[PDB]
Design a protein around this ligand. Sequence first.
Ligand SMILES: CCCCCCCCCCCCCCCCCC(=O)OC[C@H](COP(=O)(O)OCCN)OC(=O)CCCCCCCCCCCCCCCCC
Lengths: 563, 563
Amino acid sequence: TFRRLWPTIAPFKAGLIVAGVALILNAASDTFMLSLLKPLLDDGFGKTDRSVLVWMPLVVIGLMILRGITSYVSSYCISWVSGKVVMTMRRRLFGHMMGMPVSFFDKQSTGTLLSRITYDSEQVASSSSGALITVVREGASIIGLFIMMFYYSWQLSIILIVLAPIVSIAIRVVSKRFRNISKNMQNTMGQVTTSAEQMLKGHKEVLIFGGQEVETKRFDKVSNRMRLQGMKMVSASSISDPIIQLIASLALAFVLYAASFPSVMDSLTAGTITVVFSSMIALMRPLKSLTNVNAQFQRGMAACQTLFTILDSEQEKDEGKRVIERATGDVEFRNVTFTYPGRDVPALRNINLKIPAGKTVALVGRSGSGKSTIASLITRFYDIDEGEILMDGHDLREYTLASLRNQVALVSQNVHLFNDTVANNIAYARTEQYSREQIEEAARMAYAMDFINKMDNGLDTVIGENGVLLSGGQRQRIAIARALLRDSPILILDEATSALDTESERAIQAALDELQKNRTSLVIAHRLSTIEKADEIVVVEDGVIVERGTHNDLLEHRGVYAQ
Amino acid sequence: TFRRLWPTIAPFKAGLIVAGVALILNAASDTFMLSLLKPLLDDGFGKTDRSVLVWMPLVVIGLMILRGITSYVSSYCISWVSGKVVMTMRRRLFGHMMGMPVSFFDKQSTGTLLSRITYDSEQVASSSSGALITVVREGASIIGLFIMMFYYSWQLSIILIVLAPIVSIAIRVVSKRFRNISKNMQNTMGQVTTSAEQMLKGHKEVLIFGGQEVETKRFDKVSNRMRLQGMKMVSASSISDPIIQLIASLALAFVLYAASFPSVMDSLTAGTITVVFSSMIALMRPLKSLTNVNAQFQRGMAACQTLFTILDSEQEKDEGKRVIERATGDVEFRNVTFTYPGRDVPALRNINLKIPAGKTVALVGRSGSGKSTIASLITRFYDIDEGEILMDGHDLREYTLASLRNQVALVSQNVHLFNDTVANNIAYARTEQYSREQIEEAARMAYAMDFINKMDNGLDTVIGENGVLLSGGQRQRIAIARALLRDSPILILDEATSALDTESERAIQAALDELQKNRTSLVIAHRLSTIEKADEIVVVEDGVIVERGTHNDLLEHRGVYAQ
Ligand SMILES: CCCCCCCCCCCCCCCCCC(=O)OC[C@H](COP(=O)(O)OCCN)OC(=O)CCCCCCCCCCCCCCCCC
């Protein structure tokens, strides 16, 4: 439905009427130029008069100055409406996927929704504004070329106004045929493209098992299947326009044969028969464009109703009303059982896990099928199915989501770096209240500044993409710095260090023990240093915990934790 | 570049002459139709004949049956040439891409290199065949129209052959301006889509730090920078064609004003004035295309030199002549040191590692330092820098590389499945010598067959992409069946199935222990049962050997065996 999209375009109505009257005036500029062919052959090369050939080059430049200006104005004042509309409805998309849950981002829709901001909204504004250019402009061309034809010779224009529905019907059925094989072939193109992607993706096993002559013989059958499909693109799209221009020229022959009729027709001068038989050649592109506009507008509305799936999608549930000033209370799981959205296997059994205030709790393992999931549930990235993760005596759903996520603070080696200054990157969404003094003391407290003070601009450098691209261990260091300035009683650590950097690890672990000196830390473990610094060690195997306690009690009976 | 591409198009040369003589006949069919306006305005309507006006409709259709036929013939016999040249250039890319090293596929060129098969190999012959349609057709239109003007009015055609270089120069400089702005803007379009991508990959750690109103104040400054950049296309792509058709209309008005002179007029009849003023309107699309063919042919040959580097890159080095029928000898690492291509840190330091025949060398190390690296070195995926790995008494280089990889078979649940039959997936690269009795017995030895006994078609179903999409465990078990039938003397198992499965592992472990009861089997260890079953455990951590010996000696001296 177009009526959903119209309140977006409704503020920019003036550009649609200024260019709307600059498309009628553009199509009444080549119409009044084909109407100059009557007083050129009748009055300049019929009756000999040089006078019409004196001002005729002047109006020929005049109508082309008008046509050029009116073509620039209409293609700027529509592409300002169709630029501001896509700007508005893609910055409304972005404001609706910054509140839509992580499970929506977690492989329900991948990073290709970048293309659903950049391409799928430009295609709406370029197929609904290109379907107004060929409705106003070619509609005014059809209207104006059927006035000057009716003014000069009504006898041929009656035949033409009969025949032009027949030529439009022919254009519709011939274009609908190509639209049938194309949208049917689309699937075999997808199959034949993934069939060549798959063999290239298995390159290593191709070289190992020795099928560099079998896979060659299989690429002699899929490339031959791409060739024999690309030749059916051109056996269907290049039979279309020869058929269209032959049915259309049958109208060019019927009007020409009807102009041989002795008395009812053939009272037409040379200029009149030049105007009628040159407007007909100029009637072919208005007839082609006005017949295929509904297959262009419904390529814009088919993407607009694709974009509005997101605009009516459910955002993240902020169904809580209480605000946490500081989470001094200890967060504790209570009968919590969780299942991943989009899957049926549960990643969390019925588990009570207490994280005491000021005491770190380790998560020792590699995958666990639930280790990073447990870290995600405290931040409420994925909403809980049943159970209650009690936070200061109340469940997470009781609190407002922004104040809930203010208490938690993840730290990762794969942390995100914005295209901002490192002063604002340290203090994201806290630039106004938290001044530069707190930022520089917190950067010095985490021992970050030894890298920052030696940079090109100090605390003004751009770190992210199209930036200086700071180090992998410096990503965790800048995550310590963002974890600093406090107001974060809960810390989430992964430690993806792997290869420890020499002489920077001595400051990284110093800042890490500064991070874990107080406050309710929950760390997942790949380093035995964080393991022996842990207080209550938690180990999850195959999505469940059985064994808990400190390192000594888990060292008394080995199980799978010790080795 | 075209002199290197012409040996590929030279077998398909008969389609380029049939279409090349159909494009000329197509361009000489609308020229002979604009030559039908002289004996229609003079001999038809000027001198009232009625004999002219009945044969004229039959040549209106007579030159559109010809125009349609030669528009279909020349667009089927060039898209058969530019389908077969694409097919040959795809089969030759692929044959020079299953012999390339893995280091080419490893981060030197990612999964978009399939585009070089699909899009880029199509782009070269959709821009070198479209630059021949333009040269032959619109260069035969210019020739044809410029025969027709000099036949009909030589006075109003010397002016044309003066002005059409000036219009051609104008089109060239105006289109060069648009190409300059576009190829300059390209970088800023990439910058703004990157700066929109990076906010969207980081949805998490925006909700955490609270920046859901800072992020929509930065998208208000990049979506306002894609808007103002689309408005610089439409202020540069929409000022081009008005300027072009105003400069051309200046030439049209100069020719119209020159036809008012008594030297030029009184030799122009009422039909001659129509032909040299309707073929000039039909001279615009030949003049616009023939000054932009070099901006098309140099986008095809510049898309031909991004694929003739892959056709000129060095393949993987088979600089060996010895063949191994069966390698019962011990694989001995002798002073082997290896660094990754594209990086400077060594992923494998100076290492001596004994792999005994029939004994399992479990790599109990972790964190991705040198296990998957050494599993690639034994197969000679990436060639060695210094040192020598000795395979039955000689280095891998001395051997032919195909037999060297025939000795070794990787086993993984990350192994690739092809879109062939299951029996041919078990007997890949050898299905004619290896009969189906051996395939059935080897699938029975791997305990997988029952699942394929309950599949849809027995040992005949398609299993790859657009297939049944088998389980992760049965993928590892069908790799077991493959390595069982192929009888590889040296085994490399990765053990990606740390999370075991009920009812599958009872046969998976039996098949695994059946397979590694023999063979020089190096195994990457992540499951403690294979660690217990191992003979000589070798630890690798951050590039170097830590401990060597059985697990009891590693129990006596702990080190990182427990870690
Ligand atoms: C999706 C598929 C598309 C298929 C497309 C098919 C196209 C078929 C044709 C459609 C357009 C037909 C337009 C007909 C216009 C006729 C105008 C006319 O006859 O006016 C000429 C007339 C002069 O005639 P004459 O008497 O010879 O001259 C002597 C001068 N005193 O007088 C004049 O000089 C001027 C008189 C002005 C009259 C204006 C008429 C406007 C017509 C508007 C039609 C709207 C189209 C549909 C929109 C629906 C809106 C609800």
